């Protein structure tokens, strides 16, 4: 329904895709319905924790990130639909912090890791099963276009490589009408 503000809570799992690991964290959305079908959502999560490895070296590094995302949405159906799927599009902001190499990587002549903040596009496919006037069950799949820079020191020498990451976010949540 229009003018409605609700909040979902549940699991948010991020899978890098462009060797980096996956991590599942608490995910909160704060959606506001503009019309009966247009919504404006904000994704927010607890900081993720990804282990980083490559080929022979293995888990050499570890980075944390926060990927808030702002989305314009379209909910299919009408205001009396208990099953409303939705598609979303909008920008992502990703910030990295507590980058640190481990014992394995620090013996490889590796120091000072820092990924630069990234902005990019984000796509969205979700589904709201509305249980009643207040409760709902939700699934959403996110595709974000992430472009950071990897800065590190190889044996004291500055390294600087740009990557594309394009991770998938899978949220299984449960919302409430506020």
Author numbering: 35 to 52, 65 to 224
What text comes from the article?
Here, we present the crystal structure of OmpWKP at 3.2 Å resolution and draw structural comparisons with OmpWEC, both of which are conjugation receptors for TraNα. The structure of OmpWKP was solved by molecular replace­ment using the AlphaFold-predicted model. Continuous electron density could be observed for most of the structure except for Gly41–Phe52, which were omitted from model building. The OmpWKP structure consists of eight antiparallel β-strands (β1–β8) that arrange to form a hollow β-barrel in the OM and an extracellular solvent-exposed region. The extracellular region is formed from the extended β-strands of the barrel and a single α-helical turn (α1) connecting β5 and β6. A hydrophobic gate is present midway through the channel consisting of residues Leu89 and Trp188, as in OmpWEC, where the extracellular entrance to the channel is lined with hydrophobic residues. The extracellular loop 1 that connects β1 and β2 is missing in both the OmpWKP and the OmpWEC structures, suggesting a highly flexible structure. In the OmpWEC structure an LDAO molecule is bound at the extracellular region but loop 1 is not fully resolved, suggesting that the inherited flexibility cannot be stabilized upon its binding. This highly mobile structural element on the extracellular loop is likely to shield the hydrophobic face of the extracellular region and it could transiently open to recruit hydrophobic substrates.
Outer membrane porins (OMPs) are an important class of β-barrel proteins that form water-filled channels in Gram-negative bacteria. From a clinical perspective, OMPs are important in modulating the diffusion of antibiotics into the bacterial cell, where mutations or reduced expression of the OMPs enhance antibiotic resistance. It has also been shown that OMPs participate in F-like plasmid conjugation, a form of horizontal gene transfer where plasmids are transferred from donor to recipient bacteria in a contact-dependent manner. We have recently shown that the efficient conjugation of the multidrug-resistant R100-1 plasmid into both Escherichia coli (EC) and Klebsiella pneumoniae (KP) relies on the formation of mating-pair stabilization via interaction between the R100-1-encoded OM protein TraNα in the donor and the OMP OmpWEC or OmpWKP in the recipient. In addition to its role in conjugation, OmpW contributes to virulence as the upregulation of OmpWEC increases resistance to host immune defence.
